[PDB]
Ligand binder design. Structure first.
Ligand SMILES: Nc1ncnc2c1ncn2[C@@H]1O[C@H](COP(=O)(O)OP(=O)(O)OP(O)(O)=S)[C@@H](O)[C@H]1O
Ligand SMILES: Nc1ncnc2c1ncn2[C@@H]1O[C@H](COP(=O)(O)OP(=O)(O)OP(O)(O)=S)[C@@H](O)[C@H]1O
Ligand SMILES: Nc1ncnc2c1ncn2[C@@H]1O[C@H](COP(=O)(O)OP(=O)(O)OP(O)(O)=S)[C@@H](O)[C@H]1O
Ligand SMILES: Nc1ncnc2c1ncn2[C@@H]1O[C@H](COP(=O)(O)OP(=O)(O)OP(O)(O)=S)[C@@H](O)[C@H]1O
Ligand SMILES: Nc1ncnc2c1ncn2[C@@H]1O[C@H](COP(=O)(O)OP(=O)(O)OP(O)(O)=S)[C@@H](O)[C@H]1O
Ligand SMILES: Nc1ncnc2c1ncn2[C@@H]1O[C@H](COP(=O)(O)OP(=O)(O)OP(O)(O)=S)[C@@H](O)[C@H]1O
Lengths: 252, 252, 252, 252, 252, 252
């Protein structure tokens, strides 16, 4: 249902204390971090330690959904609202009512939805596409981005008004390279995960761990996870030394 | 429905007297000011103290709406007007009839709509897109921009003719840094707002207030508001001294 | 429908006599003048005192229309002519047939349309975009610019051939600062306009008038008009002395 | 369809004899001359006294067409050739097949098209943009410029190879100031033109004619034509003496 | 049912050892390689040497299926789900249950399906289009692309999260030009194939083989295969020397 | 397809012997000479007497192609490589594979392409723009310039490394003025050409020939060719004496 946040680094302790400070509030949470730094983890964990903890967790991938369809997707539509609407459909908002609405890649939202979103957050009311019935919405907002929304705001591609209404309680996730002391504990977490799912088994010696620590980790913790998966096939039930690492990961 | 305008500074008193001078007139109001300086506040307040006060308030975000769709959005369209127009739809103008039409980010209007808008303001007539039925429009115009329309006019990006028809009664909103004497009263307003919505509670001591007063406030009053929100979570039901401020806001 | 041209200055008398000389001819009229000097006024007045006086007046704003769409906008298009042409549409030319076509900001026309325009004026024939049906056009041409077409022609940005076919009968509108003796009569005209529309009422004393006369009037007569509008709100049904002027307009 | 070339000057007689020498040949004609010196006149006249005389006359304005679109415009394109090519279209070349292709402002051709043009002239073959079907082209070339192609060639802005393939038979049009003896006969031609089109009527006395003869005529014969048009409105059905000339044209 | 992988090159031996390492695991396999390099071969071979070896092999061509229909095609639909859904239909996923799902041209997947796919891979649950019944899915994932997914990820056209969940065990197929030592053995394989299907017979001499070895092979091994087919018709039951090669393939 | 090289001068005999020495080699040929001295003639003749003689001849005009587009033009591009690349396109190199690539105006190549070109010549490999697929290239290089590449190299505008890789076998074409003994034979060649194409007929007497011999010929042999073309129109089927020459060409 959720994951804990593993690590001993100052920053990850800070993230945990921050998470606790805000979870049971209904305040808007914006999580920033590079891809695969733990942002969704933080989000679902926030939800199951919140007032929405017995409600729905409803993700929206703002970048993945085509701009022309994003409106219907968030707000639902009436039958005949647009071409291909032989249905009347509840939106992500409607489904998220009483639970959490998790706005991922919020920087990839089109300006048109950024404004529509803010009126929904401010008024707490919405209409399905093609409708004039105003409807009630009770969602806790959580958002995440890997983009620099501040520069976007200067570029004129992200709304400043929306920025401050979403950024009440920012949480910053450090990239893996800036917390290489966490790698061993994260590796224990990932291996243990794999062993419980019956996906295999490995373990790393100390040499191979400090080699991993000089890695730059462009995919951060998700890329660490990937590596655990590949080694489990390449050296099944084996011990991973420098030699068992792919050459890309050996740093000596 | 509306907010009052808090503050004791010369400028904010001047804005209030100006607001009263013009509210119950149907004259075009242009409000200039940096993001989050109170421009919408001024606008809705003007509306509910105007002849449109029992009519509709209909916002248009000129920058948010894609240029190709702005025409339909203001003037409505007939069925088949363009690809995807399986509907006939009333425009923002049509919905604003008898009430107020609030033109926000008016500098972000495309030149093509700037001309079309002016013929509507001058003739007081319009057609839906794809139609030849001329229709009647009775709206009070209110516009707002954070841009320098004068320089835009020299750059050739804003229409001079439209500028003078919109700028009958300019109202200038001072940025927060130029009225730091208002911060305490605005803080009382924002806290009181939060306490009434049951979003929490804080209060600021004098040290922390004058620290806030040396802040530059790039997001102005909306950024002040944001800070009240974050402190309410970081120090719930607490008193905010210099130490309780984020370091970015401590100036001693 | 039209406005008369107010004033006693030599130049404005000259403009009136010139207007009469040419109105009932079908000759091409080019009106030059700074923004807000009366150029459209001259144009519609010419039309309603011409052979087109019972026909259509069809404005084109050459600068306002995006260059990629200007062709269709003047000449119309067939269905499928370009992407988004699910329609077949009559152009500005087609709508102007038998009436007047008023070419405003003609210096802002792209060179590509300058040539296409001239073949239309010379051949008196055109095709809709995407079509090969040649069509007949009977329009009286009136054009206006605030730009220096002669320098444009040397810069290579305005076509010389088009210049002479349009500039058969030039009419020059003096800027307001060069005819400050007209200000009082224009003020009477503008006030009387406002009083008839029920937009309010003022009047200017002699001190305030000669203060206005030392003004430079960058927006010329349209800017004069704007001021009458603002004073009507600032001093409703009042008399405007030097003191009632905004400081920008006091010159003593 | 065409115009004759009026005048008694040595040069204009020379142009006529030259025109006859080359008309019924298929040789490349380059006509040089200042704006409005009769270059198009020479061109269409050449065409209707040529082997293409029952074929198409197809003008291309090399300066007017945007460089990015000039290729498609001359050679046509396939569907999908470039963004916005939902059409397959025949080029100016394809339309000119069997008739004349008149290359006006040939000095304003971009170097990229100068090379492409020459391979077409040499190979006598072309492809539509986005296509690999080679197509046949039978056009007689006529070109005109007011620019100094020789200096352009030294500047590196005009192709030398293209220069010699186009300049087989140069025809030079004298500017009006260098043939002021022609003015009277040209004035008879222009007036007679105007009288036949029912655009009005004037005539010039001898004083006014020799005043015109000391004029420098920057717009040459097209500017002469313009003047006949303005006088027809200023003194309808009148006789034009020195006094009836605009002051700019009085030279005594 | 499957094909073996012919060749003696280091890389092809490496591919075989890699294939064995991972076949009987249920790990996600991503095969990269240019068109016709053996990627499907690797895939079906993996399947019939896997835990799915008695289950279904279910190909999806992500590029071939229209984006609007890809969702239904993978997940199935309910009756009335969309216009034309008079049927209820099992998806590719549903049909692949217990067997292998082979995701070919995975880079040609639309971002909208990339996200939907990942939730299916992570949750291991799905709904038919128009349905709210969650369903179970047990498939082994195999994917293939000729595109550079890493650059796609920077271009923002391929999801990074999906990349790492699919790229657990990458297998790279060398293009034919980089393993020209394999050509002879592959030719023996292809000829033997043809002879068994009774499609004809040839054989290559040594001269013609080393001519083939200097070929660049844009279509790689599938293009090699094509050539064997054409020679079998051009020189039935013949020996193929340099002279019997098409000129495009002679390199001496 | 090609032309022979006419003339009896030492230099032209030397060029012929040089041409034979190198044609059937794959060595890089650099041809230097003033505009219109026979450099392309030498090039195509080299090609049709080479190992590429049944392959493609693919000209590139380094000066004519805009610097920003030269890269794509030589190397091709992938779809989306740059703005306006809705296509994937083969480059001049790709089209020249197995045949000749003729680099004309090689001194007009930008330094950026000079380096990229050399890596292609040295590695014999390339990528389309926006791609990471390395591709094979088999072209014979022929280059031509009228510029002084040595001085360019000192000016720092031409790469020295590229100079020596291109200048393996230099061939120098003498300007026409330095071989005036060839004029008669070249005139026979050009007339005979014209007579075969049915473009007319002339012939020169001895007086007119030696007048031509004192000419300086800035356009060299192409300018000679031009003159034959003009005389064919000015004196159709005539004999050209000193008197029939244009005055510019009479030297007595
Ligand atoms: N501190 C952590 N402790 C344990 N597992 C972690 C931690 N951080 C990340 N992970 C795991 O590493 C992976 C990271 O996944 P996510 O948190 O979903 O990435 P993300 O930051 O949300 O990336 P996006 O797509 O840009 S929002 C998952 O497998 C997590 O379970
Ligand atoms: N004088 C004021 N008194 C009380 N509240 C204020 C005052 N000025 C601003 N606010 C509040 O501060 C925030 C400012 O919001 P807006 O007035 O809507 O900003 P804006 O100036 O319209 O910015 P934009 O997007 O560029 S038009 C809102 O929460 C207002 O309620
Ligand atoms: N001589 C005049 N008498 C009366 N009203 C005038 C006179 N000149 C201008 N106006 C008024 O002043 C304003 C000037 O408007 P226009 O004539 O439309 O300006 P314009 O010169 O056409 O400017 P553009 O946009 O560059 S073409 C209008 O309100 C006119 O009614
Ligand atoms: N010799 C002439 N006899 C009679 N009419 C003439 C003569 N020369 C020019 N004209 C007229 O004067 C005008 C000159 O027009 P064009 O010949 O088209 O000018 P142009 O030289 O082609 O200029 P461009 O745009 O630089 S190519 C036209 O009205 C002609 O009909
Ligand atoms: N190593 C090999 N040994 C034997 N046959 C091979 C080998 N590699 C390829 N082939 C054959 O060559 C052809 C290549 O086909 P595929 O493997 O299906 O190509 P592909 O790489 O999957 O291309 P796509 O469409 O981009 S996924 C088939 O006829 C295979 O049987
Ligand atoms: N020796 C020759 N014998 C016969 N014809 C020749 C000879 N030299 C030149 N020509 C002809 O004269 C003209 C010269 O053309 P090119 O050889 O193409 O000139 P070029 O030297 O390549 O000039 P550029 O543009 O600077 S590379 C063509 O018509 C040739 O056919």
């Amino acid at each position: 249902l959720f994951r804990s946040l593993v690590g001993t680094s100052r920053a990850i302790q800070q993230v945990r204390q921050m998470m606790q400070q805000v979870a049971d509030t209904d305040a808007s949470v914006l999580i920033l971090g590079e891809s695969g730094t733990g942002k969704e983890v933080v989000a679902r964990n926030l939800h199951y330690h919140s007032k929405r903890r017995e409600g729905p967790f409803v993700p929206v991938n703002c970048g993945a959904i085509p701009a022309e369809l994003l409106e219907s997707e968030l707000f639902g539509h009436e039958k005949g609202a647009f071409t291909g609407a032989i249905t009347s459909r509840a939106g992500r908002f409607e489904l998220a009512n009483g639970g959490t609405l998790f706005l991922d890649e919020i920087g990839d939202m089109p300006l048109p939805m950024q404004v529509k979103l803010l009126r929904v957050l401010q008024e707490r009311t919405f209409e399905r596409v093609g409708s004039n019935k105003t409807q009630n919405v009770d969602v806790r907002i959580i958002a995440a981005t890997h983009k620099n929304l501040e520069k976007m705001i200067e570029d004129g591609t992200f709304r400043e008004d929306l920025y401050y209404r979403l950024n009440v309680f920012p949480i910053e996730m450090a990239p893996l390279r800036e917390r290489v002391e966490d790698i061993a504990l994260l590796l224990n977490e990932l291996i243990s995960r794999m062993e419980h799912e019956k996906r295999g088994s490995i373990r790393f010696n100390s040499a191979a761990i400090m080699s991993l620590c000089r890695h730059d980790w462009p995919g951060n913790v998700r890329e660490l996870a990937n590596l655990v998966e590949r080694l489990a096939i390449m050296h099944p039930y084996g011990v991973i030394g420098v030699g068992e690492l792919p050459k890309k990961f050996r740093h000596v």
